[PDB]
Structures are given as structure tokens and as C-alpha cells.
Amino acid sequence: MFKAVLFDLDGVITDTAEYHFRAWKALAEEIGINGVDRQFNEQLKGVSAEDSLQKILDLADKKVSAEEFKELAKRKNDNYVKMIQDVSPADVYPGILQLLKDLRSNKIKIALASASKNGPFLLERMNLTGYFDAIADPAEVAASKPAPDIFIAAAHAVGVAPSESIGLEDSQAGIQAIKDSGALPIGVGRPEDLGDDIVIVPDTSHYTLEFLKEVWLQK
Ligand SMILES: O=P(O)(O)OC[C@H]1O[C@@H](O)[C@H](O)[C@@H](O)[C@@H]1O
Ligand SMILES: [Mg+2]
Ligand code: NA
């Protein structure tokens, strides 16, 4: 039996992947880059703020000064942080609160493996902080998604091996990070985006302890 679940936040616990997308798209268009559509945004999910901006600049073969890079990243963050102020417990995705309760009842550790610096604030907005045994700080890892470091850190922070853990993710980069950590990935989203080679559920209501159990036994 698995001993921990390692949660991504954005697009898994709540619909904040939508807000990252909207904020990055707005930023890109301000600097004359029009290619950040939903399809391109699949390459941005799960990756750090710096890597997101660089991927956007690369899309247009654009070069900015170091000073401008810092300002642009700050501008997007300030916008994103204003978007999320009204997030509340009502915004928790279906099934997620119940899963957290069921994991705790069964003495399964719960850790956050979000690349987002805004992760702790969002857990507070959603009254979820008390369910988490650990939050892996994305600033403390040497390498960000799709490197496995944040999932390894999350598992270690709750005293469990990655190989005894399940990771929940909505992103290509994050699934790869889970795979390379040794944990078992279960994605949420469209097969057209996350791959046909792992277990994928179409929506978070499918993330039941029953199903994680159904899944684990068969790995
Ligand atoms: O800019 P932040 O809040 O640190 O977020 C970093 C990344 O956090 C991840 O959780 C999101 O999937 C990415 O879209 C985002 O870029
Ligand atoms: Mg995500
Ligand atoms: Na709160």
C-alpha cells in the first residue's frame, strides 16, 4: 500500500492553471507575442515562472534585457496574485476535500509538490493547510519541473520514499517529474495532452482513495 500522496496544486486542487494561463497570455500579448494559446500553454503547465517566461520569449525568438525579464515576471505575478485573492473553499475541485479527509483517516501522508510560490497562500484561501503534512518549497530545490526534485522533496518531507508514493498532476512537465522521482503518476486531463502511457482520469472526482487503491494494486 502507498504511504503518501504528493499533490500538485494548480489544475489539481483548484482551477488556478486557468489563471496562470490567462496571466501569461496577457503578459505575452503586452510584449507583442501572440502564440500563447491553450495548446501552447500545455508546455507552460507545471514549469516555473522563469521557465514560463523564457518559453514564451523563445516562441518569438525574442530577447529582452535582464532588467526587463525581471520586471515582466513581476508584472505577471502581481496580476496573478490579484486574480487569486477571491479564491475560497468553494473553489476546491470536486473530490479533493474528501480525498484529503480519507487519506488522513487512513494515516496516509499528504504533501504539496507545487512549483508555485503562491501555493501556501492558495491552500490558506481554500482552508486546506491543515490537511497537509508538508509543503515542498519550490525555491529550495536545485531543479524545477520536469526535474523530479520537488516530488522527491515532498516525499522526503513526510518520511516516505518516492517509490511508496502516488503523485497527482495535470501537466506534461509534472507527469515527467513524477515518473523520474520513482512515484506512481495519476494524471487528470485529456489523453491528447498528458499521454496514453499512464493512468489518466478525466476530472478530479475520480481521485477517490478507492481508485488510488484500485490503481496502486495494478502498477
Ligand atoms: O509563478 P508561481 O506562482 O511561482 O507559479 C509557478 C508555476 O506553478 C505551477 O504550479 C503552475 O503549473 C505553473 O503554471 C506556474 O508557472
Ligand atoms: Mg498543475
Ligand atoms: Na482561509
SS3 184: strand
Q: Which CATH number goes with the domain that contains 38?
A: 1.10.150.240
d(CA 104, CA 99): 9
Residue nearest to atom 5 of ligand 1 (CA): 116
- Calculate the alpha carbon distances from 191 to 1, 150, 156, 203, 216 in Å: 27, 24, 30, 12, 20
- Mutation test residue for ligand 1: of 6, 16, 48, the one with most atoms within 8 Å of CB: 48
Residues touching ligand 1 (Cβ under 6 Å) are 9-10, 17, 20, 44-49, 52, 77, 114-118, 171
CA of residue 18 to ligand 2 center, whole Å: 10
What is the set of active-site residues? 8, 10
> Taking the CB of residue 78, how many other CB atoms lie within 10 A of it?
11
174 alpha carbon, closest ligand: 2
Contact 52, 24 (CB under 8 A): yes
- Calculate the alpha carbon distances from 84 to 10, 42, 53, 77 in Å: 12, 21, 20, 11
* Domain ranges, residue 22: 16-84
The minimum-distance atom of ligand 1 relative to the CA of 20 is: 14
Residues in Cβ contact with 21 at an 8 Å cutoff, skipping those fewer than 6 apart: 36, 38, 41, 44
Please report where in the chains the cell 516525499 appears, as a residue: 155
d(CA 47, CA 124): 22
Side-chain half-sphere CA neighbours of 145 within 13 A: 29
- Calculate the alpha carbon distances from 125 to 32, 84, 118, 195, 212 in Å: 34, 9, 11, 32, 26
The minimum-distance atom of ligand 1 relative to the CA of 77 is: 1
Closest CA to 176 of 133, 134, 113: 113
- Residue-wise burial string across 8-24, b where 16 or more C-beta atoms lie within 10 A, e elsewhere: bbbbbbbebbebbbebb
The DSSP bridge pattern shows strands 165-169 and 184-188 to be parallel
Distance of CA 144 to the CA centre of its chain: 11
Report the amino acid identity of residue 165: S
SS3 45: coil
CA of residue 136 to ligand 2 center, whole Å: 14
How was this one solved?
A: X-ray
- Calculate the alpha carbon distances from 93 to 23, 31, 119, 207 in Å: 21, 33, 15, 10
Q: What are phi and psi of 215, to 5 degrees?
A: -70, -50
Size of the chain, expressed as the number of residues it contains: 219
Residue nearest to atom 8 of ligand 1 (CA): 116
The minimum-distance atom of ligand 1 relative to the CA of 80 is: 3
Q: What are phi and psi of 145, to 5 degrees?
A: -55, 140
Residue nearest to atom 11 of ligand 1 (CA): 46
Distance of CA 136 to the CA centre of its chain: 12
Declared resolution, Å? 1.3
